[PDB]
Amino acid sequence: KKRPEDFKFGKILGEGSFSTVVLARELATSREYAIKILEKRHIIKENKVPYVTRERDVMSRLDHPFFVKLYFTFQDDEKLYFGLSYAKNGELLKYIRKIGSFDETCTRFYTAEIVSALEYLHGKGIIHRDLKPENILLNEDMHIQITDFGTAKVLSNSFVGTAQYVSPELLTEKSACKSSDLWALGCIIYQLVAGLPPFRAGNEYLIFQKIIKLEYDFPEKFFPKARDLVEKLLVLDATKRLGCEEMEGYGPLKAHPFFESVTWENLHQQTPPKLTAYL
Ligand SMILES: C[C@@H](Nc1nc2c(c3cc(-c4cn[nH]c4)ccc13)C(=O)N=CC2=CCC1CC1)C(C)(C)C
Numbered sequence: 001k002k003r004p005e006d007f008k009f010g011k012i013l014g015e016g017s018f019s020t021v022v023l024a025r026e027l028a029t030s031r032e033y034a035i036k037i038l039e040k041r042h043i044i045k046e047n048k049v050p051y052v053t054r055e056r057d058v059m060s061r062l063d064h065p066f067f068v069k070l071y072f073t074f075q076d077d078e079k080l081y082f083g084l085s086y087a088k089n090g091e092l093l094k095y096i097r098k099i100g101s102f103d104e105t106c107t108r109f110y111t112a113e114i115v116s117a118l119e120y121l122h123g124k125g126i127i128h129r130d131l132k133p134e135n136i137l138l139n140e141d142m143h144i145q146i147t148d149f150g151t152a153k154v155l156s157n158s159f160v161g162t163a164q165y166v167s168p169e170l171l172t173e174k175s176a177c178k179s180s181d182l183w184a185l186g187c188i189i190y191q192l193v194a195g196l197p198p199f200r201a202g203n204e205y206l207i208f209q210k211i212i213k214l215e216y217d218f219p220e221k222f223f224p225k226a227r228d229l230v231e232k233l234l235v236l237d238a239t240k241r242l243g244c245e246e247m248e249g250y251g252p253l254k255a256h257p258f259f260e261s262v263t264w265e266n267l268h269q270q271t272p273p274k275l276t277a278y279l
Pocket residue numbers: 013014015016020021034036068084085086087088089090091134135137147148149
């Protein structure tokens with residue numbers, strides 16, 4: 001039964017559309033948390049409560065090493081607070097920007113960790129819907145910590161994610177499936193190898209046009225096995241993407257030649273490779 005006074009608020013880690021994530025140290029224990037702060041007035045005013053509820057619902061269901069954990073929640077007169085795990089190393093995007101094109105060892109390790117985390121998520125009947133490097137974080141040990149579930153979809157038509165990673169079905173039919181996250185995974189693998197996402201244009205309208213037309217090109221340098229995987233993920237028909245139900249699930253995706261040498265069991269217990277560039 002914590003309150004804002006139990007913590008000393010430090011540096012701002014990140015900013016959301018209606019939220020701020022701050023590093024906080026618990027006075028009693030000296031333990032660090034990333035506390036997500038939401039102004040109640042703003043959330044009531046902009047009708048943002050269902051997003052707060054969705055993130056609360058989604059996060060309370062997950063218990064996996066590759067996801068940011070929700071520890072506690074409290075509030076005062078003005079603000080609503082969420083005590084989350086601290087991912088010391090920031091966003092995976094920061095390293096994409098810092099180093100550019102990643103080597104094969106690095107690409108394989110990180111792709112495998114994202115594949116492993118998606119399998120968990122999809123097996124729980126949850127679709128992320130906005131999977132991107134900005135919301136794939138890195139903890140002290142350099143292991144992935146996926147976050148940003150306010151816009152996720154629980155299974156038992158609304159939201160459109162970041163334009164570079166949107167699946168064609170989400171644009172056209174307005175409905176996301178688990179396979180929509182596999183499209184984002186293809187975009188992320190390309191980005192790790194190439195240093196840039198596959199669909200690039202002057203504006204969002206022009207990016208969407210390239211998505212629906214499958215208008216992207218591979219650079220010469222691109223790893224042959226990673227290129228094969230990307231071609232098997234960036235497929236217009238969502239029932240023909242490597243990893244989906246219709247395609248026999250995660251097993252054949254984990255079996256893809258790109259993952260040769262990956263021990264799928266306990267990846268979070270394996271030492272990640274030092275992040276190295278490929279020139
Ligand atoms: C994706 C997200 N960015 C971030 N969300 C979280 C971080 C985090 C840490 C750094 C970091 C570490 N060192 N320096 C920066 C940079 C960005 C972060 C953390 O440690 N623990 C929980 C988080 C998450 C929360 C959940 C509400 C989305 C946005 C911008 C939406 C706040």
